[PDB]
Design a protein around this nucleic acid. Sequence first.
RNA 1: CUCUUAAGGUAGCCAAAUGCCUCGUCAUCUAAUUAGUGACGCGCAUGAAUGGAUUAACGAGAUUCCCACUGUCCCUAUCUA
RNA 2: UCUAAGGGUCGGGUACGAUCAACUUAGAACUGGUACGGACAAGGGGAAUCUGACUGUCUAAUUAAAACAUAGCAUUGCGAUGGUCAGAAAGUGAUGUUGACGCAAU
RNA 3: GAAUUUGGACAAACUUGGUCAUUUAGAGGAACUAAAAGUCGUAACAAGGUUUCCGUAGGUGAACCUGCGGAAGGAUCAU
RNA 4: GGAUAGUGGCCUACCAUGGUUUCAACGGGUAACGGGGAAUAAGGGUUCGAUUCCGGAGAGGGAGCCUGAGAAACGGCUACCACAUCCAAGGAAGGCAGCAGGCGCGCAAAUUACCCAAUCCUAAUUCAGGGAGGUAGUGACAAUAAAUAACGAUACAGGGCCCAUUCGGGUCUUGUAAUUGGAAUGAGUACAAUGUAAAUACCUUAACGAGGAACAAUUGGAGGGCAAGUCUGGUGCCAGCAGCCGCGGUAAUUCCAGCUCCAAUAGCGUAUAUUAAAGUUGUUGCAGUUAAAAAGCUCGUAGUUGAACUUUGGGCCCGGUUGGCCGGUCGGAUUUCCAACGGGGCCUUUCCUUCUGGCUAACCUUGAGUCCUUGUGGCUCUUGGCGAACCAGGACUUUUACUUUGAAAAAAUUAGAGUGUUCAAAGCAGGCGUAUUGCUCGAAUAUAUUAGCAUGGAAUAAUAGAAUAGGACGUUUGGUUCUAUUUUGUUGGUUUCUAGGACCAUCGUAAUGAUUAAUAGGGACGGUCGGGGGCAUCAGUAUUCAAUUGUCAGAGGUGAAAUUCUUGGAUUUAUUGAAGACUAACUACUGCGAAAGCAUUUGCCAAGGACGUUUUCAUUAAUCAAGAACGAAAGUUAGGGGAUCGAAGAUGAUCAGAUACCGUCGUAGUCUUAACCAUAAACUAUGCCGACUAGGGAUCGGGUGGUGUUUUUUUAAUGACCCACUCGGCACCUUACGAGAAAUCAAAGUCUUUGGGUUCUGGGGGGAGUAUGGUCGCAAGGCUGAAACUUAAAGGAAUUG
Lengths: 97, 129, 144, 150
Amino acid sequence: PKKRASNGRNKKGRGHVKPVRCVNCSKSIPKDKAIKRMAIRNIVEAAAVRDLSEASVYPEYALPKTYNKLHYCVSCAIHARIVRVRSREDRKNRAPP
Amino acid sequence: TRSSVLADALNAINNAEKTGKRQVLIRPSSKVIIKFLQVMQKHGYIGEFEYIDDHRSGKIVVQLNGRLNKCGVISPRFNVKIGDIEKWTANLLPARQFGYVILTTSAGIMDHEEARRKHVSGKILGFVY
Amino acid sequence: GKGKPRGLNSARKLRVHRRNNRWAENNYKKRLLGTAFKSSPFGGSSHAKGIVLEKLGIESKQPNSAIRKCVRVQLIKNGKKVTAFVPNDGCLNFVDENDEVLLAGFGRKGKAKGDIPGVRFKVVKVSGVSLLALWKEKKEKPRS
Amino acid sequence: GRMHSAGKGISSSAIPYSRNAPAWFKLSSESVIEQIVKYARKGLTPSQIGVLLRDAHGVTQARVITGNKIMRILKSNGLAPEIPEDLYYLIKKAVSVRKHLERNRKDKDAKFRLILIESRIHRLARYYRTVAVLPPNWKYESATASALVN
RNA sequence: CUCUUAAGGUAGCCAAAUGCCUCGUCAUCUAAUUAGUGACGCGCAUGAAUGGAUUAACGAGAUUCCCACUGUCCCUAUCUA
RNA sequence: UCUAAGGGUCGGGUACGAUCAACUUAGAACUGGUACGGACAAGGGGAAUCUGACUGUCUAAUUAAAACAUAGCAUUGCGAUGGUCAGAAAGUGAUGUUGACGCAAU
RNA sequence: GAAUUUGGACAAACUUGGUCAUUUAGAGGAACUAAAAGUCGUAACAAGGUUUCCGUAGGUGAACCUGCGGAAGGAUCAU
RNA sequence: GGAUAGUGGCCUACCAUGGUUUCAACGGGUAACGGGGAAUAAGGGUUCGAUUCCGGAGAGGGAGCCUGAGAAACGGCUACCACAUCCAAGGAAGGCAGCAGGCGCGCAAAUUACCCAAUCCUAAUUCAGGGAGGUAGUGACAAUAAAUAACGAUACAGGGCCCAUUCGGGUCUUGUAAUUGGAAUGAGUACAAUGUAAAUACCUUAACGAGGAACAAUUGGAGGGCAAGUCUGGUGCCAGCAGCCGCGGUAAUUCCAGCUCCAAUAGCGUAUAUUAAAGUUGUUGCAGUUAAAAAGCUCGUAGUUGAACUUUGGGCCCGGUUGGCCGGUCGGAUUUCCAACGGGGCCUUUCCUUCUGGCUAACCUUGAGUCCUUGUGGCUCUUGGCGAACCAGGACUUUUACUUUGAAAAAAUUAGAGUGUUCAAAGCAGGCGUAUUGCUCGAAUAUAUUAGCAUGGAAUAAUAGAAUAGGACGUUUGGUUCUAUUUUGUUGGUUUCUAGGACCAUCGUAAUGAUUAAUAGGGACGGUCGGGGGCAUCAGUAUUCAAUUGUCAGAGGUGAAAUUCUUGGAUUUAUUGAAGACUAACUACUGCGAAAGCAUUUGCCAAGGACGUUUUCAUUAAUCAAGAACGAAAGUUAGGGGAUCGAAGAUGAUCAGAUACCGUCGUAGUCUUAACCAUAAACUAUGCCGACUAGGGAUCGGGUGGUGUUUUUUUAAUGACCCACUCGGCACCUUACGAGAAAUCAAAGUCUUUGGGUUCUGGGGGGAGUAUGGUCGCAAGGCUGAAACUUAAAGGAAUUG
């Protein structure tokens, strides 16, 4: 007569969005998944701030910041970046610090 | 598309009852529904109600008391042959001594005991206990 | 409304759905015509006769480990070569090359039985006498 | 629910309980019908007329103000149009869409939309033919669509 | 694992009009087949536009078998110019 | 030996009558030593394999083919003070009354 | 009024093909299944050591690998 | 119309072009004549129905036929076909799916027996004939009752009862005993009879017939499921058992044996088929987020389903079925009483078919009423009212679905009343005498779905009737047609009225005729809304290459090295140009689209949501097998374009190997034109429409209002804000009120207190989404889609470790 088999499990999204390659390892990835961080630092370090200020022409000067948005591939995020892994309850929470 | 207005009304009633209320804005009425409520009211399962009237639909606000365990509808409205009503009473009601399979015959909309007494049958609508 | 139709005039659609959805049991084809008669070794029959081609030693399935003592019985009606088990201890000693026998289903409505792989027919009688009788030594194997 | 679109809207116009009245209303029964007839002569639909009278002048609703609907009132004086208004409008839309499609090629969505509209039109035709306001064995088609707009 | 090249025959296909050994071995066609056909293929020495493989249609092309039909033959006889 | 069905022209006190022509096709009887496309004229057919696709062309005097050709594919060189070729030279010539979707060579 | 004939319908039957169904031989090919200990590696399951898997295309003794897109059944519900 | 016994395409001449079909035709299969019924069933169902009553039969296969009222007969012919009988090879005779009987098949099934006594039938017929039938033998298919041992006393130990008097004896009973005795039988033989057609059996019966070594019970099992061994000897993953899980490898609660025991018992296993279990077929009544399942998406015919709305009520009588004083009768009932239960009338605007009517019936009929508790509880008569209560007729009275009641619903069987079958299955018998030449009760009762029939009911669910009025009544009034029994003097001819047939005509009557406008749907209109689509058009940067370059030894590249390119200036900064590339950052639990999927500017082309709306339409709709548009990425076809990235490929490393990961290049592609292609983890692995239930904020898009704030030109108008509110969304947070196997869920809820409408899919895993056949496609592949065979778990959630 007639007889056969199987299927499986679940998660949520939206529809479709275009990918943005991993800033570290060049893996493709969408932006609901994403894992993103804002790299917002000065050009100068804490050590460099004096040596410059001393040698600086112009009073007050400037000291701007290198801004850039960094996108990771989840795989690479756990390799280094602040993501790690949390408990059954903590993986529901969305607050950063 | 409401396939049965009565059905939805009864559903709403039951919902309210389960929630533990004393009132229900049910919609959009019918003579059948009114008759149903006359049967229910007759056997204590609902407190005295008020049919409100806007021309087109006609809503109702039933002041239900709390005696009601469960009212419900049987769709499709089958055809019943007097000998059959036993099986219905055996099937869907809680017990022999109480609970009313309400139904429609050529005499009118009424409970099953009344139909037995009258000695007629026709269709089945639903049940109340 | 729980998938299926609850129309008063549906009936047709219901019965046809059943006719469609009934096909999920090998036993359903047995009641219509019979898979037994077109395919299968036993032609819609309880028992079946045949001739012993050769004596066999089948390796048992794990965790068991033994040699089970069976026979390739070629049947008489169909002529299909089928493996068959020899019940009780010894009893392979009673049967010879090319003797008429009588087979029966192993027990599980076709299929295998326990540690024996492939074989699905226990021998009952050999040369017009039961294996049991031969084993207990109530009656003996008629040579003539 | 909506017949084709996914939306679930209930943007509609709730008539009050008042069937007689408005009580505050002035005027006579002849004036309103006359006005109706005027804008019919002018060449507008039961809908558009109904709008224009209601908003600019005093007619609350045609059935309340007179004793009949606008369509019937048009029919009586020989000013009802060749086919039903809404269906006509749909046909007009469809023709326009087809025209638009003719100039294009790679477009898909508009084709789908056309098809949807056509379906609706067909359904309407089934209805009107069933009640017999259009002729029986009357049919809309793509080839003689722009001929039907006249 | 190894010697060895510029690289070491790939996809396909064959005792093919390409295979010596050969009448290759197996099956099929027959009473009987170095013929034909299907297979197998470390192929003496197949093979990719020196084109490989497949083909509907066409063929005064090459081949084998079968139905029909015959003096081709058994087995020769006869008549006409 | 019959029947039927195919049409032309003239007619209306402001439905169809008269006539004139062909051949085609069908159907029916009736009939003969079952003969009848009567002589004449006029396809053997199929199942497969090999090979080149095909129509076409050639060794006029032994080879008509599986050879050549072809459409299709691929390649190469060439922007005219050019490419491929001719000429003993020539104020010479073919492609060229051409121009890269063209010409030449495979 | 028997043999015997003329015509006719009803027609078994065989000869021929055409079929529709049901079986069944077959060199050779390619599968699947089982069977205590057979060779080759180790492809998934832990981040299985290159995250898996899906579709599709190619490659490769073998698991498999690679491309483009997708999913997460992820190793992330997160500025 | 022949032929028929008569109808009809039965058969054709002539003419027509029909008939049937997704409401499943036609074809194919059937291990299919059918039903009555059998198995098993809480209800629902599921399986089987070969087995003495109809056109189809059928007589080895067909076809033909005479005879007869009846036959397409076959225990009758004719032929052919297939097989096969006997010869003095010329020729003849056959048919068994009636009994006896059995080759191969087998899993499987009986004496070449005696008789018409029953039971029936046929013949001119009580008298014959019947392998129909009966009778036995064969008989462990099934069913019924059913022996295989009983019992003292003694030797012991208990336990209940009698005198209720001590220890006195007991009627007794429950056991155990190499303690021992009499008794009672049937099997079996059988004088005999009975029985029967004649025998065998049985029901009776003299005669012989138990003491164990006898007149002897088996078949399974003893780890769990599932009642019964931590006994003995053997065996050593060997032999074997084991439906399933598992036992056995030197101590077996499972094997081979003993011993003991436990079931069922003249039967018990064993095999296959089926029914329950099985809600693992699911209407009642399943599942589909993962456990097996929702088609990618949308349309769309069939089918299924589909808002409300139309005498509801209020009265006044009449009599029933019930409740109970009264037991005025002797634990039997009457008739007047409070209420219930559904009835039947008449009235409230209610022809609640009738029109011509006889009986005009029940009656304004009353001729002088009485053997009545006045209060109306009621048997009682006299000359003459309203058509159904009885029939005669006609005129037209939506069309069913539904349901009540009735027959009609062959018997055995089923449920089941009675009853000596010695009980019982059964069978339909029998009981009772004044067993003197007699009496009498039975062989009931119920079941029969669907359809067909009559018959009330009229709620629910369908469906027509008055909307460019050829519309209902009608005392109106001409008229145009057609019919007509009686009579005028009779049968006929035309006529006059006459009664009715229809049709038409202007006047005549009625509140003259159109239900809503569904928090259903469609449609217009309004200013808005958007990374929705198409067609162009604009910008952006980087990437690569080129020229100019300014310059000087290592630049690429990794975990580290190498390939690699390098003063025939490399990487590298600045000035330009060229080609494709993609729309960064902004960009979010943000927005549109049916999805697939879509982000620069601007224009044009239509389209769409929500919202607003005392606009219109008026059930138009919800989902949908067939059929159809779109459908990522990768592919394919022929052009273009061909910068980066990059299947194949080459490579340098890596490593035991590397044709893989890491590197450096690089053809198809990535882009586009016109074609194809139809798959995806096409994913919220959550169908769609509708209703109802918990709170909470936040947000996109309208809308409403507020002496609100902000922005110009203090002020006006908008925009932008803030606040409150409400509609439609993308969603979220908190509980579980509920749901769930949990994980989790505002829907996976309102589902054993199981039914709002509908489509699709799944029924242990594999084999396999394979084979074959269809179909679409240039191909790659796509849709549709099995089988044998194999196997006890695969699996899904969680829980520790």
